[PDB]
Amino acid sequence: YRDAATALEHLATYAEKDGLSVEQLMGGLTYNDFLVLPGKIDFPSSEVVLSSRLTKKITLNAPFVSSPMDTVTEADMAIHMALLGGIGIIHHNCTAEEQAEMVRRVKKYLASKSADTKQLLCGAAIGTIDADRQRLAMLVEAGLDVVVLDSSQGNSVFQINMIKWIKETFPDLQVIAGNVVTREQAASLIHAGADGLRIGMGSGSICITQEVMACGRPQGTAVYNVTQFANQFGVPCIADGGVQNIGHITKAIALGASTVMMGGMLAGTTESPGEYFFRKRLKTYRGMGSIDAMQKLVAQGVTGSVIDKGSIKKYIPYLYNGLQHSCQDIGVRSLVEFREKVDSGSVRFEFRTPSAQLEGGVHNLHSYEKRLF
Amino acid sequence: YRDAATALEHLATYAEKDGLSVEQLMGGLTYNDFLVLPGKIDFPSSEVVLSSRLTKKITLNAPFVSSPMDTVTEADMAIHMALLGGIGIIHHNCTAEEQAEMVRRVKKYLASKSADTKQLLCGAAIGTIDADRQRLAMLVEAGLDVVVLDSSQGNSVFQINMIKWIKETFPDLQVIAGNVVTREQAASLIHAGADGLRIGMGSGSICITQEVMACGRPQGTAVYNVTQFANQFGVPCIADGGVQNIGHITKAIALGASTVMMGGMLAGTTESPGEYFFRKRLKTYRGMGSIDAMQKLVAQGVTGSVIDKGSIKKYIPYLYNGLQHSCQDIGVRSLVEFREKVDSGSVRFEFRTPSAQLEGGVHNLHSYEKRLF
Amino acid sequence: YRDAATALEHLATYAEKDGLSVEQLMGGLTYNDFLVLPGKIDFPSSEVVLSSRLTKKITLNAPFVSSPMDTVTEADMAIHMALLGGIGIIHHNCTAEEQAEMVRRVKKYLASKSADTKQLLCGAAIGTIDADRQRLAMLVEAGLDVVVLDSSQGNSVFQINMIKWIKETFPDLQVIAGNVVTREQAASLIHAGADGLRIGMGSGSICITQEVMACGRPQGTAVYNVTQFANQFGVPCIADGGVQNIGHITKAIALGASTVMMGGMLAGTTESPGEYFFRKRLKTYRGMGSIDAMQKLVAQGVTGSVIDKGSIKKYIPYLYNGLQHSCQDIGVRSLVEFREKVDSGSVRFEFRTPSAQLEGGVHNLHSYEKRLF
Amino acid sequence: YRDAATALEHLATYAEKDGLSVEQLMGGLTYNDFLVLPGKIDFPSSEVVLSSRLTKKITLNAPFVSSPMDTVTEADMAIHMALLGGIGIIHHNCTAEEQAEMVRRVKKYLASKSADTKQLLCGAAIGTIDADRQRLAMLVEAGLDVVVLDSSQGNSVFQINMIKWIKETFPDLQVIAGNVVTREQAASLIHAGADGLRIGMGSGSICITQEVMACGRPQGTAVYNVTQFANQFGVPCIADGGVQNIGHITKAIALGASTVMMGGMLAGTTESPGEYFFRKRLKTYRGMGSIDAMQKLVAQGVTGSVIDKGSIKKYIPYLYNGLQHSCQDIGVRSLVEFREKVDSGSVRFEFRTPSAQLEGGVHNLHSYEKRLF
Ligand SMILES: O=c1[nH]cnc2c1ncn2[C@@H]1O[C@H](COP(=O)(O)O)[C@@H](O)[C@H]1O
Numbered sequence A, B, C, D: 001y002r003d004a005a006t007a008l009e010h011l012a013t014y015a016e017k018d019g020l021s022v023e024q025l026m027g028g029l030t031y032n033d034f035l036v037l038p039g040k041i042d043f044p045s046s047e048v049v050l051s052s053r054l055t056k057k058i059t060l061n062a063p064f065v066s067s068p069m070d071t072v073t074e075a076d077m078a079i080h081m082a083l084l085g086g087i088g089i090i091h092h093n094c095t096a097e098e099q100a101e102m103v104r105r106v107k108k109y110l111a112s113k114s115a116d117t118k119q120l121l122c123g124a125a126i127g128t129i130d131a132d133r134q135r136l137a138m139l140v141e142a143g144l145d146v147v148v149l150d151s152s153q154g155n156s157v158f159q160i161n162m163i164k165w166i167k168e169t170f171p172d173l174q175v176i177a178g179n180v181v182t183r184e185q186a187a188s189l190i191h192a193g194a195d196g197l198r199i200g201m202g203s204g205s206i207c208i209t210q211e212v213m214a215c216g217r218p219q220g221t222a223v224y225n226v227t228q229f230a231n232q233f234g235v236p237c238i239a240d241g242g243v244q245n246i247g248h249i250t251k252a253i254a255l256g257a258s259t260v261m262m263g264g265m266l267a268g269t270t271e272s273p274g275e276y277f278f279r280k281r282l283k284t285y286r287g288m289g290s291i292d293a294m295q296k297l298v299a300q301g302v303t304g305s306v307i308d309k310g311s312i313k314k315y316i317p318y319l320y321n322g323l324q325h326s327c328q329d330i331g332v333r334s335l336v337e338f339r340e341k342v343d344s345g346s347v348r349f350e351f352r353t354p355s356a357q358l359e360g361g362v363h364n365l366h367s368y369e370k371r372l373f
């Protein structure tokens, strides 16, 4: 046999590292279709830094964003998301007066705060019609820090003109455009002057766009191809939709996302809008393209329910600490280093067959209780 | 970082567009195995034109055809299908006298109408035996506009001779031959003088041909290979079977289909034959190769039930408006442009892993109600 | 557009026929993973001949063989299998005296008959131990026509010596060796003097060999690789296991099988051993490697139940007529021509994605009844 | 046709053996994704030797190791595992005093025994913190034969230093490091001075690491790549996790594992800790990363239940005799020969499509009882 002392040296006899680079990995796959291979641990998980760029000029201490949906994010969610190092995007399924009030509630309230006034950071969504011009003006007056142009298909003349108008009218304000899933879409909205990109189409838990429009993209592939382009321009991208656990968050970032947006995961929490009901304690969770949401006609989302998840004061820290441990297993001390080591090919990946996915999950038990924390 | 002003220019640094061309996409896959990537929106969905060639000389305002099945299309269906810009193919699981009466009912009744008499367009199915010669003569007397030669395997001497006979005897009448799923089948029936082709074998919701005959083809692949050939001869093709939502319709056309035929989707509607019953309001839906259908012995279809879908006066417009929005997302202003941009490689596609398909649908909800419109 | 008259000629512009040849098709797939593409119909299904070589010197009018299992084939099954143009292999989970009696019952009783005595053809199974030497002698005295050496793994010194002994002692008797799934296994038993081969390992409905032994092969792949070799020596092969419908039979033969063996399909029929019981009218069906079967300790099969299928006097004709229609759709007039056209590349195949398989089956119905005939 | 006498000779006309070599087989697959092809039987299964290297200096008569989990292995399990030719690894979810007592119970009690004192061999697990240094000293005093450094991610400075310390302080003691799933991890811990490696991350039945950490590897692939490296240094590797039947054990070894570790399979047995309860006779089985286990906060395992499996005095022999039959089918007389014939390419493999896996299992039965032995 070989001398154990030569073990590390012998690795050089191999053409490349074990596993695949991100380039080799990247068809039409998404998060559950692969794993990241473990690396070398020479630091505690507590040492892991999770600072993340939301936009060109806005950086969060945590890559967590609550989605602009009327069953996920209002003032209560936005406040506590900001307090916990993330941020919330307030929905616009409401009057411009009602939305502005929610913004004021946040602004008048690791924490995400402005550098000048020390006020909590607040985001909000708007449509791309002429009526939303006045809406935005009201939100800006309320102290809005960042606006999300809310669309399933963001590459449009209407959105492009909206971007151009905001940059001229509100230069200080940061603009996140989307949604997008292709390189060509990204270039268009980057060229328009977007400060960030929202990635995803049909990956949402409550979304059926892909079913009824035949249009969208697998989330993992969308994140890679978009960010591979957008990152060259220093435009941070939000991985929006299909996120359901800590593992999805790590993978989203690995593929180039700067932050991740969550709807269903945050739906059913105490801080979410809507009241609990019993059927088991549930809350309503619905796509904004659902008939209910649109009426509150071609639906692109559904109305459903999610079980009580408790307060995000316990859930977000779980995501935070969990993501720290994830980075540790991979052998990276920050999300910045995570990005660098992936693009350099140091971090390695591996595909997962359907059998490997079943093996990866809980299997062959009479019964079990899934207590995450 | 790169200057945002160079974003669109930088796209030229890439060898090809993001995603796959239809050629690259096209083994043995069907509709659910892929997506169309979104494009550029610079028009309203209302601007989208859905005019479609049914046959060489017949063009519809909507690519919707009701299947010739005794649980789908009789006079009531055919009338309302024509009124809504589509057309109905009346079944022949009935006497020649009974079928001709149904045709007369339609003819004596965006709308699909003749250019000379302004009467509603009507289609009908027949077998390929000698007895159907007289049957057809009766249908022609009733004012039939187009005939469908109804067979699971249309590439036969019997069908070929039937085609040849009709073209000689009834030159004005348009003939749709089928079903076919291969290039060789198409050439044979095109050579015979077919004015259109019916594509599909075993893709039907109620069909088990592939199970009991081991013969057929995945619908998506069948449409591509057949139309890639048939379109060179200006022979429109009907994508028949396996259509269940708007997404399937968009994809069918993307692969080369001119129109799409629906059975199960239209079964259970008010305009369909058969009475509602309760088990939940249901209607019977059965393959014409089912024992029931054949007796009203090797079965190639099944007898089943479908829930009440309501009137097609609300369902077809939903398909219509939905398809308009689908084209908009893709960035095409008509089905003609859709065809052109696909064959040129402007429209791009993406595969879907099993995980991506699960992600694409509704996932990780306690419960939900699927209200399409 | 192109002139329709040139349609058939234009096919020559294509490098190869639509679809795949069997070579191109053939990893690790089985029957449900592919389809045969339809061809040209210029004959009635009644014209299709299904004569099939069971062994070097024995030819059946139907490629149907009942498996040697104590819940499938005793005298009653063997008699009626022979009468209907197939043959039955009597099990040996019984005394040598008991088995010989069953053989005598068949011999003393399209039909499969001897050319000299006009008596029904009869097959029987035996083990490969020394005790089975006397057993066989008794079966031969009873008028046995063909013997099956019954083993999950037929490539053994014990089986090889058993083959050699039979050929010397009983030259007239035909010997089917097996089971096998590889080329190397086939060569060994062909070299030993086998008159036919039994193909299959772990493909059985009641079999778990692959689970507990990690040894076996996908049935489709096994048939191709074995027969590709065995056919060069004029050694007919039985495709044994995993057959569940007419489609599987057509595909088995397409890949090189001369006949097919059925257990589960024939289990639960009136002619099968064991009594009906109620739980719905059921019969017991069990692997011969099951603890029950072995005790009537490492099990390689299970004990289960199957619903009443009725008499094989109606089921086998259904298989017969169904297979005729299958050949017709493909455009072949006999199983001999089927073999020839496949090996020449005239018959074409197509893969099936998981989606294509779901599409191929019954889908999207509230409910349905599967009446085959 | 060809002369049967030339059958074996004709095999030489083929470029390579039927099926795939292990290299060709080896992406991201695991055990259920493939089969081993049968070989030549020229010996009885009783002749098969299952001696296996646990570590550099420790060899077992059976490749069976019980996992260090508080619902699997305490003194009772460890004793009977050693008696039956395997070994048990005692968990450390208990005080150092409690663990040492369990070791003494084993030491003071085909059988796995020391060569000098004839005492039963005993293994035990420990953490990699400073407190475990004293713990180990107590275990060594109790007569511990081998220590397992218990971690989901063994490639750490803490584990590396722990290894280095043990080799200096307790030279006689054998050290198994892990867990690992990559080549780079292996080299690191081999270089540190490991006497054996524990392979697996997220493949456990009760483990969700891959879900919550996005980190791990398909078990089959992990075993191959790690052992392909580790075996060059004569470092035996334990395939840990995802083992559920005899088939998995055979495959684990085929890919390079020297022994296999079982948790769930041995959970629910009489010799396991914890009492039976009724819900059907069940026992608790839980991941050591479960909240319950950790509290007896980011969970990486779950708490569940498994049905009563009976005594391992009947189960392990079943595994033993089953593995013998498995080797026989493959045509190897020992696990050593198994290794040699695989690396030489004599043993062949075959992929399994999802259809082939369904075909491989029990299918198309009304009902069945799975009696393994
Ligand atoms: O009705 C809808 N149609 C289309 N996309 C939607 C709809 N509702 C929400 N989404 C998207 O889906 C995301 C939520 O995905 P989830 O986090 O998987 O629930 C949102 O942030 C939106 O990007």
Ligand SMILES: O=c1[nH]cnc2c1ncn2[C@@H]1O[C@H](COP(=O)(O)O)[C@@H](O)[C@H]1O
Binding pocket: B067, B068, B069, B152, B179, B200, B202, B203, B204, B205, B206, B207, B208, B209, B240, B241, B242, B243, B261, B262, B263, B264, B265, B286, B287, B288, B289, B290, B300, B301, B302
């Ligand atoms: O009994 C049958 N055997 C074979 N194909 C059938 C049968 N009944 C209907 N079909 C085909 O299946 C289509 C309906 O498919 P669906 O729209 O998926 O229900 C029809 O238009 C026919 O082309």
Ligand SMILES: O=c1[nH]cnc2c1ncn2[C@@H]1O[C@H](COP(=O)(O)O)[C@@H](O)[C@H]1O
Binding pocket: C067, C068, C069, C152, C179, C200, C202, C203, C204, C205, C206, C207, C208, C209, C240, C241, C242, C243, C261, C262, C263, C264, C265, C286, C287, C288, C289, C290, C300, C301, C302
């Ligand atoms: O106990 C068993 N172990 C292994 N193979 C078996 C056993 N019982 C039956 N078989 C095989 O499985 C075939 C039946 O497959 P089926 O037709 O799919 O039920 C038989 O003809 C045998 O070749």
Ligand SMILES: O=c1[nH]cnc2c1ncn2[C@@H]1O[C@H](COP(=O)(O)O)[C@@H](O)[C@H]1O
Binding pocket: D067, D068, D069, D152, D179, D200, D202, D203, D204, D205, D206, D207, D208, D209, D240, D241, D242, D243, D261, D262, D263, D264, D265, D286, D287, D288, D289, D290, D300, D301, D302
């Ligand atoms: O809580 C846990 N987190 C991660 N891995 C675990 C945990 N509990 C057990 N394992 C691993 O899973 C193996 C058991 O796998 P099983 O044999 O498939 O149940 C153990 O031997 C450990 O290697």
Ligand SMILES: [K+]
Binding pocket: A358, A359, A360, A361, A362, A363, D202, D203, D204, D205, D206, D207, D208, D209
């Ligand atoms: K797992």
Ligand SMILES: [K+]
Binding pocket: A202, A203, A204, A205, A206, A207, A208, A209, B358, B359, B360, B361, B362, B363
């Ligand atoms: K979705």
Ligand SMILES: [K+]
Binding pocket: B202, B203, B204, B205, B206, B207, B208, B209, C358, C359, C360, C361, C362, C363
């Ligand atoms: K079908």
Ligand SMILES: [K+]
Binding pocket: C202, C203, C204, C205, C206, C207, C208, C209, D358, D359, D360, D361, D362, D363
């Ligand atoms: K099986």
